[PDB]
Amino acid sequence: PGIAQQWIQSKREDIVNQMTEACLNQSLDALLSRDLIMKEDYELVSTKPTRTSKVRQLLDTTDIQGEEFAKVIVQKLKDNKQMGLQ
Amino acid sequence: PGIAQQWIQSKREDIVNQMTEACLNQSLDALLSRDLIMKEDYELVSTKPTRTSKVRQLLDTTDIQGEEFAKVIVQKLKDNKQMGLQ
Amino acid sequence: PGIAQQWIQSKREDIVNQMTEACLNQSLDALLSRDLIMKEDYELVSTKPTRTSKVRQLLDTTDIQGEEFAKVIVQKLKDNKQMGLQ
Amino acid sequence: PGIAQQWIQSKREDIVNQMTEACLNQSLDALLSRDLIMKEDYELVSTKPTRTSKVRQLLDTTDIQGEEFAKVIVQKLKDNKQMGLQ
Amino acid sequence: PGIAQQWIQSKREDIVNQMTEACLNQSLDALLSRDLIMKEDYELVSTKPTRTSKVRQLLDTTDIQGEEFAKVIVQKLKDNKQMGLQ
Amino acid sequence: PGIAQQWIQSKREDIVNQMTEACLNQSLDALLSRDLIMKEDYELVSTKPTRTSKVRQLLDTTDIQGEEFAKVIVQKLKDNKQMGLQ
Amino acid sequence: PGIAQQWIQSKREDIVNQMTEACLNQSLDALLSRDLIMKEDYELVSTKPTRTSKVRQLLDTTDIQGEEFAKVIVQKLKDNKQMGLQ
Amino acid sequence: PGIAQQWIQSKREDIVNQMTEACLNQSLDALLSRDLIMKEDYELVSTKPTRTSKVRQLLDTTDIQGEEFAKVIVQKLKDNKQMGLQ
Amino acid sequence: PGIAQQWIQSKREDIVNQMTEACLNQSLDALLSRDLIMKEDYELVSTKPTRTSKVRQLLDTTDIQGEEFAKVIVQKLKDNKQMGLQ
Amino acid sequence: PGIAQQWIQSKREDIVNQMTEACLNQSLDALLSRDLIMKEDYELVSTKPTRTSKVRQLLDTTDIQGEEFAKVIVQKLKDNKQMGLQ
């Protein structure tokens, strides 16, 4: 389940066609800052040639990683003036 | 039987060679928005290397899942200007 | 089958090595003008590094999308002084 | 969908071959004025060697960013005496 | 048996490591020109990640499809200055 | 194949290191005179920083565009006292 | 793990939007001075068209190369008056 | 077992996240120099989209190929100033 | 096997880090002069962003194309004062 | 490796910010005197708008070209009263 994952599964159809590739990559590179994502799934989500799987290979990784994963991907998506829901 | 499944079995031969892979994936990722499909059959239908089973592994999953499953896969196939039958 | 698709499958070997990448992109970006192609298969056909799949990932998308799709890709290929067959 | 995006997808084929590179850049640099676009997709849209992708890498970024993004790119395209539609 | 298939099974070990992927794809896309191959095995042979099965998934498809299939795959392999045997 | 393209593929190695950048540009700008090349591949061939791709991005564009394209690029290369072969 | 890599993964989100492209290139060309980086990954990190991957294709290369790699990339980032943390 | 394979299975977890993709490819292309690896598993290990399987599809190929295979992959990993163990 | 391919597989590790990108392109464009390479693998080897695959996507194409292919790529590498072995 | 290249990789960080653009160009034009560099990489290194890549696009070309290349670029850098190391 998860408390940080109350919303990213709820608006996954929102966050696939609204989170741009740099707002993807300003956060996904930030996931390697706390050693909080792994250091070899990064070149599996970045190596996707299209962006529609470059965002979703993160978006199922955040479905499987813990709530301590998604609690830091969310304010990196609220600091961008995109849309606001916690 | 089903009321939402009155049509997807009726035009399964239509929907295999007319529903493209992104119109597949704009709806199949939307199935995880309501927690309405599961979170581990998704990487079983997306991991199909060809598209002719990437669409049909959804299309038998919607044959087995309920009418509350297929009632939301249908207007995600009517909003796309493809073909119209309810 | 299709009536607009009477010709693009007929001369697919013609249209792969004769439709240039800008005549590709002057029409493929025009497919997003009527909301007539999707908004996330576009960065799957444009992200192809070579042009020989940058044209064909459209050319099978127009094999799977309807005749209302291919009826607008054809006069965008007849306004260019390339070759004329409807 | 979007209300500010009622028009930029509607006339994307217009705005690719009519919005010049400085009317591109007088607005795209203005997107960094409100911290309203990101500060590392800017050198991804400006680094495109041709102009036909220097305008469109903005034009799909405005397809994915919100209506608060496109509501400020539009009067920066109406103050220029080019063409008028809201 | 087959008369057009007198040679492609005879030099299958030749044609796997000598027919390059574009000479593969200049002919395999040409197989969809006469509606002569199907329109959903194409994205099963192209979706092979390696080329050593991207050529052979055609090369067993031409073992199972008729002599009217292989009679058109052969001069698309003789027009290329590669090797000549009918 | 082509009848006007009997020679430009035949002497492409000649025409890359013998057609200078202004004899490139006196003809490539002349291709926009008949609306005979497109109006957004022009700033893709001119934006090449080196001349060795500024000539060849035309020279593969004339490999893909028709014989009505190459039949007008040839006497713009025979009026210049460079070399004569039709 | 690494002792020189105690910090570059720690402030990777810092070093992506603060290390400029010449402070990138004054150090990345200096990595070829000791034969300490390879001589064919250099034109893979420099060939990135945007700077946001021109810095990060080094920044994951320093995640995978040893602590003898990152111990020389760090004082080339402390001699520049940018920010100081070892 | 093997004598050259005394170490690559011993530090496979080391060599997956420390051997970079060009130090992968400076050696894996060198394996085709002695005709010592095959000429159609090369485009099966290079076609892996991520690097974490682009290195390991070599790293199990060197688990199955002989000690004459691994005795030449090792000094191509000791000439690089990475880490030293025979 | 091949007689012209006695050497290019023998010194592939030489020819990857010694054949520069213009000595690549002065020969690879010359391969389209005799209609001797194809006209749609050219924009697959040139579209490689790095040079280390821009040379090798030719160097495996010459591993798969015939000895009549490699017999003309070799004196285009001996006329350049680089290194001499037939 | 190379014997003439014992030093230019050793002091590449020296030679990037110490070899001025005319001492670049008095030697790089001299490389076309013996037909010793090519005649179409010259307008790829000179067309670099900045000098920091106008010197380095030579400085990796001399990393890939032979020791007969670098043995003549060195005394053209020792005749200038700049710094002396062979």
Author numbering:
A (entry chain D), B (entry chain A), C (entry chain E), D (entry chain H), E (entry chain B), F (entry chain I), ...: 433 to 518
From the paper:
Upon cognate ligand binding, NOD2 oligomerizes and recruits RIP2 via CARD-CARD interactions. Eventually, the NOD2 signalling pathway triggers an inflammatory response through NF-κB, MAPK activation and autophagy as well as the production of anti-bacterial peptides, which protect gut epithelial cells from both residual flora and pathogen invasion. Our biophysical, structural and functional data show that RIP2, via its CARD, can form helical filaments, plausibly nucleated from one end by activated NOD2. Furthermore, we show that RIP2 polymerization is essential for NF-ĸB activation by NOD2, presumably by favouring recruitment of downstream effectors such as the RIP2 ubiquitin ligase XIAP17.
